[PDB]
Amino acid sequence: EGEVTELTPCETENPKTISHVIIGLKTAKGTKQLKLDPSIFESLQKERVEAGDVIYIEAN
Amino acid sequence: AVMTAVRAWEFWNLKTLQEREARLRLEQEEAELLTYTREDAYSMEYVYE
Amino acid sequence: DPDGPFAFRRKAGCQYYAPHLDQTGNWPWTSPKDGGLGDVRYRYCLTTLTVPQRCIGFARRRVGRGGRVLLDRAHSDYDSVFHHLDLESKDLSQILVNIKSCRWRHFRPRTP
Amino acid sequence: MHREVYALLYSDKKDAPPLLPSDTGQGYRTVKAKLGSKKVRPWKWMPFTNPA
Amino acid sequence: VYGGDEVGALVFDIGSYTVRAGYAGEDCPKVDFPTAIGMVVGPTYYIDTNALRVPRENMEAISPLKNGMVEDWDSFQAILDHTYKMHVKSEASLHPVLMSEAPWNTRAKREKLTELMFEHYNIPAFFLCKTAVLTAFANGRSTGLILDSGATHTTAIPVHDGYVLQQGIVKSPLAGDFITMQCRELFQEMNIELVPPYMIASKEAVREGSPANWKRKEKLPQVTRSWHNYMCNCVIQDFQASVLQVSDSTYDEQVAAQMPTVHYEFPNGYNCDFGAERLKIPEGLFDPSNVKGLSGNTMLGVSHVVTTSVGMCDIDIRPGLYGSVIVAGGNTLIQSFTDRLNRELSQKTPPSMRLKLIANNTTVERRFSSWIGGSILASLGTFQQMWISKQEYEEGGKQCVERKCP
Ligand SMILES: Nc1ncnc2c1ncn2[C@@H]1O[C@H](COP(=O)(O)OP(=O)(O)OP(=O)(O)O)[C@@H](O)[C@H]1O
Ligand SMILES: [Mg+2]
């Protein structure tokens, strides 16, 4: 969980193709970048997550 | 071609993530904090129980 | 008799300071574990800030030249653990046990 | 490990820098109104008598 | 009551190697130009690096300081004028001046310096503090043993409560000049022709030990032997800084030979590996009995100078002296000098007293420690009572310095 600071997709050549979705999360303790599975892009737009939005992501 | 490209890409990704971790390590070797808020400096008293 | 050459003889209206025997003396700005006076103005203790809400590690409040109150910081090998430390694996477990027993003085800011 | 640290000038060459207090740390824009609402008091280069 | 007050005072630290000057409150001297100045037969004076490094006919290289004390007051006035006009860019009568002085400065020289500063420069206030006291203050220590190894002398000065214990001062002639002489002798033994960089028009890369393939500058004017010697001393000091290293323990030929060599390239393109000879030279500071100069001499090693200086003080203060050893001076920057000194002192210090060397092994903290302490002292609000005012110099006369400045 944390405040979203970036939602930059990671473009790549397929062996536009994305291989990861980097989400930056900020908390009062600090900031962390997560190399999430690309499929999470559907849920991000479904939830309308934007920079400066507080979110939480369950591991499972 | 897919069989060869998949392995070549997996290696490229391993290399790219290692370079990213190295860049993060370099960024963390740099000083993290140099300033703190005015409220913490004067508007509060530090206590311990 | 053996002491006689340098024997101690109290005199009326006099007071004396006992010599250091158990531990060699040290400067006031040094820990009592190192024979120092351990003067509290030079002591560095774990400190937590309000922004960011993270423990910065060992720190001491010092007034600067223009009256600006500065937080000096001391390096420690466990600095990463102190960064992770808040709200009270082997080294982390020992540190947590020491803090929960309040063996370490860890300051937190509060409004007056 | 050490419970507390003692030093005069600084503890070690690897010591982290001291944290100086400052406003505008979170950006100038957020503190624009606070800084703009006031005006600084005048400072002078003036002679002073030292009774010592 | 509050933080120390800054009254815009100046801090001057005129050493035999470089003249350090600046404004009080700063953490570093704003200027440090070589003390040696060019003189043309008052005589025309060339003082700063920009003027010293260009050849001139019938220009001699001289220094106002002798044995750590000013001898030629004309060159001293010239250096002060140059410092003011070029670097300070402020009127002397507007800023108080705090100057350092040698621990062994004479009364008459102090009086003459005070007279000069007040009559000639018309300064508003003056103060004269010892280099050892300023070095101790720069480290936040009110007491301790200062160990200064400059260009002229290696001196240990015991300081207690901010006062120099003059009876405990022990001085040795082994200093930067001795190391320069040793390097000169080594180059002479190796038949290395010291070509100053001003004589080199162009140079070509050559193999190790190969004869130098360099072109001499044309239309070069005749230069005095003093200026040529000064340039040679400059290149030798560069060699000292770049190559020389103090052995971590008592010098051994086998251990020195086993360690890797260091390669140095001279200005004329000549290059060679200095092998173990780079280690033998700094050992003379620690074991002078082995120096080719005079084996039977009475000079004392730096560690012996340290132990002797403390031994002359009250035993009640020796715990403070050993508990705070402050190393200063440019000659102490030689590699591993601090480590070797610490080892030798720990071996020679009594186990009943704690020995601690302050970790100040950096060029700025070692060379400018006196200036740093002077800036600190001049910036203290409590120090504003110590200033010698012009009115005080008028009423108490030239002798007033004897009582106001301890
Ligand atoms: N990094 C270095 N390595 C070796 N020697 C050095 C280094 N830096 C400076 N020196 C030498 O230090 C010597 C003394 O310089 P320093 O600035 O300490 O003298 P000073 O205090 O002005 O003079 P003095 O005490 O002789 O009156 C010089 O001869 C210089 O060549
Ligand atoms: Mg010196």
Curated annotation (Swiss-Prot), chain A:
Self-association and partners: Forms homohexameric rings. Can form a dodecamer with RUVBL2 made of two stacked hexameric rings; however, even though RUVBL1 and RUVBL2 are present in equimolar ratio, the oligomeric status of each hexamer is not known. Oligomerization may regulate binding to nucleic acids and conversely, binding to nucleic acids may affect the dodecameric assembly. Interaction of the complex with DHX34 results in conformational changes of the N-terminus of the RUVBL2 subunits, resulting in loss of nucleotide binding ability and ATP hydrolysis of the complex. (Microbial infection) Interacts with Mumps L polymerase; this interaction regulates the viral transcription.
Miscellaneous information on this protein: High level of autoantibodies against RUVBL1 are detected in sera of patients with autoimmune diseases such as polymyositis/dermatomyosistis and autoimmune hepatitis.
Gene: RUVBL1
Cell location: Nucleus matrix; Nucleus, Nucleoplasm; Cytoplasm; Membrane
Domain text: Binding to MYC is dependent on a Myc domain essential for oncogenic activity.
Name of the featured protein: RuvB-like 1
Tissue specificity comment: Ubiquitously expressed with high expression in heart, skeletal muscle and testis.
Family: Belongs to the RuvB family.
Protein species of origin: Homo sapiens
Full protein stretch here: 132 to 196 of 456
Superkingdom of origin organism: Eukaryota
UniProtKB/Swiss-Prot annotation, chain C:
Highest taxon of the lineage: Eukaryota
Residue ranges the record marks as coiled coil: none
Annotated localization: Nucleus; Cytoplasm
The protein's role, per its UniProt record: Component of the NuA4 histone acetyltransferase (HAT) complex, a multiprotein complex involved in transcriptional activation of select genes principally by acetylation of nucleosomal histones H4 and H2A. The NuA4 complex plays a direct role in repair of DNA double-strand breaks (DSBs) by promoting homologous recombination (HR). The NuA4 complex is also required for spermatid development by promoting acetylation of histones: histone acetylation is required for histone replacement during the transition from round to elongating spermatids.
The protein's assembly and partners: Component of the NuA4 histone acetyltransferase complex which contains the catalytic subunit KAT5/TIP60 and the subunits EP400, TRRAP/PAF400, BRD8/SMAP, EPC1, DMAP1/DNMAP1, RUVBL1/TIP49, RUVBL2, ING3, actin, ACTL6A/BAF53A, MORF4L1/MRG15, MORF4L2/MRGX, MRGBP, YEATS4/GAS41, VPS72/YL1 and MEAF6. KAT5/TIP60, EPC1, and ING3 together constitute a minimal HAT complex termed Piccolo NuA4. Component of a NuA4-related complex which contains EP400, TRRAP/PAF400, SRCAP, BRD8/SMAP, EPC1, DMAP1/DNMAP1, RUVBL1/TIP49, RUVBL2, actin, ACTL6A/BAF53A, VPS72 and YEATS4/GAS41. Interacts with TRIM27.
Protein family (similarity comment): Belongs to the enhancer of polycomb family.
Name recorded for this polypeptide: Enhancer of polycomb homolog 1
UniProtKB/Swiss-Prot annotation, chain D:
Superkingdom of source: Eukaryota
Summary of subunit composition and partner proteins: Component of the NuA4 histone acetyltransferase complex which contains the catalytic subunit KAT5/TIP60 and the subunits EP400, TRRAP/PAF400, BRD8/SMAP, EPC1, DMAP1/DNMAP1, RUVBL1/TIP49, RUVBL2, ING3, actin, ACTL6A/BAF53A, MORF4L1/MRG15, MORF4L2/MRGX, MRGBP, YEATS4/GAS41, VPS72/YL1 and MEAF6. Component of a NuA4-related complex which contains EP400, TRRAP/PAF400, SRCAP, BRD8/SMAP, EPC1, DMAP1/DNMAP1, RUVBL1/TIP49, RUVBL2, actin, ACTL6A/BAF53A, VPS72 and YEATS4/GAS41. DMAP1 also forms a complex with DNMT1 and HDAC2.
Function recorded in the entry: Involved in transcription repression and activation. Its interaction with HDAC2 may provide a mechanism for histone deacetylation in heterochromatin following replication of DNA at late firing origins. Can also repress transcription independently of histone deacetylase activity. May specifically potentiate DAXX-mediated repression of glucocorticoid receptor-dependent transcription. Component of the NuA4 histone acetyltransferase (HAT) complex which is involved in transcriptional activation of select genes principally by acetylation of nucleosomal histones H4 and H2A.
Gene: DMAP1
Subcellular location field: Nucleus; Cytoplasm
Span within the parent record: 53 to 104 of 467
Protein name as annotated: DNA methyltransferase 1-associated protein 1
Species for this entry: Homo sapiens
From Swiss-Prot, chain E:
Protein's recorded name: Actin-like protein 6A
GO cellular component, one term: nuclear matrix
Family: Belongs to the actin family.
Protein location: Nucleus
Origin: domain of life: Eukaryota
Gene3D superfamilies: 3.30.420.40, Actin, Chain A, domain 2, Actin, Chain A, domain 4
Pfam families documented for this protein: Actin
Positions where Phosphoserine occurs in the chain: S63, S210
SUPFAM superfamilies: Actin-like ATPase domain
Related illness: ACTL6A mutations have been found in patients with intellectual disability of variable severity, developmental delay, dysmorphic features and digit abnormalities. Additional features may include genitourinary and cardiac defects. The disease phenotype resembles Coffin-Siris syndrome and brachymorphism-onychodysplasia-dysphalangism syndrome.
Role played: Involved in transcriptional activation and repression of select genes by chromatin remodeling (alteration of DNA-nucleosome topology). Component of SWI/SNF chromatin remodeling complexes that carry out key enzymatic activities, changing chromatin structure by altering DNA-histone contacts within a nucleosome in an ATP-dependent manner. Required for maximal ATPase activity of SMARCA4/BRG1/BAF190A and for association of the SMARCA4/BRG1/BAF190A containing remodeling complex BAF with chromatin/nuclear matrix.
Primary subcellular site in the record, as a coarse category: nucleus
Gene (UniProt): ACTL6A
GO molecular function list: chromatin binding; transcription coactivator activity
